[PDB]
C-alpha cells in the first residue's frame, strides 16, 4: 500500500516528469510508477511503499578504470552527504573523512579484507575525477565543498 509521504513524493516526481515534455508522459505513467513500486515491494517483504521504491521506478521509467554505474553510485552518496553538513552546520569533510563514511554505507556489500583496500583506493581516485569535473571546490585541512555550480 502507498504510504502518505509516498503520495507527496509521487506527485512531485510526476510533476517533474511532465515538465520535460513542453514520446510524451501521461497519467498512465503515473499509474505505471505506482505499479512498478508495487512490483519492487513485491520483490521485498515490506508493504510500506517508501519513497525509495518510487525513486527507482522514476529512474527506470525516465531512463528511456571504474564501471559507469559503480562510480555514479558514489556520486549521489557523497553529494547529499556533504549537503547534510550544509544544513547541519557541522565541520566540513576532508577526502579521508568522506571515504571512511562511504565504506560504512556498504559494509555488507564488502566481500573480502583484500577488497577493503581495493574500494578504499578507488574512492580517492573517484574524488580526483569529481574534482576534475569540478563538482567539488577545494579550499583550505584539505576542505572539499560543493563547487559553486
Amino acid at each position: 500500500i502507498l504510504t502518505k509521504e509516498a503520495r507527496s513524493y509521487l506527485v512531485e516526481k510526476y510533476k517533474e516528469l511532465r515538465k520535460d515534455d513542453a514520446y510524451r508522459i501521461t497519467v498512465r505513467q503515473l499509474e505505471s510508477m505506482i505499479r512498478l513500486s508495487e512490483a519492487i515491494a513485491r520483490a521485498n517483504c515490506v508493504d510500506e511503499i517508501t519513497p525509495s521504491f518510487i525513486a527507482e521506478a522514476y529512474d527506470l521509467l525516465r531512463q528511456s578504470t571504474v564501471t559507469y554505474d559503480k562510480y555514479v553510485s558514489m556520486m549521489n552518496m557523497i553529494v547529499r552527504k556533504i549537503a547534510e553538513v550544509d544544513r547541519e552546520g557541522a565541520e566540513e569533510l576532508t577526502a579521508v573523512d568522506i571515504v571512511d563514511w562511504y565504506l560504512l554505507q556498504k559494509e555488507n556489500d564488502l566481500g573480502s579484507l583484500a577488497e577493503y583496500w581495493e574500494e578504499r583506493r578507488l574512492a580517492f581516485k573517484v574524488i580526483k575525477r569529481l574534482v576534475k569535473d569540478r563538482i567539488l571546490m577545494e579550499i583550505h585541512k584539505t576542505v572539499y565543498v560543493i563547487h559553486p555550480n
Partner: peptide, 25 residues
C-alpha cells in the same frame, strides 16, 4: 535510509570482513 551515520569503528573493519569471508564457506 541514511542509517549508517556514525559507525566509527577502529581498524577492526579489516577483522569485520574476516567474519564475512572466513565463515561464508
Amino acid at each position: 535510509m541514511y542509517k549508517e551515520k556514525m559507525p566509527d569503528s577502529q581498524a577492526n573493519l579489516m577483522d569485520r570482513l574476516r567474519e564475512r569471508e572466513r565463515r561464508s564457506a
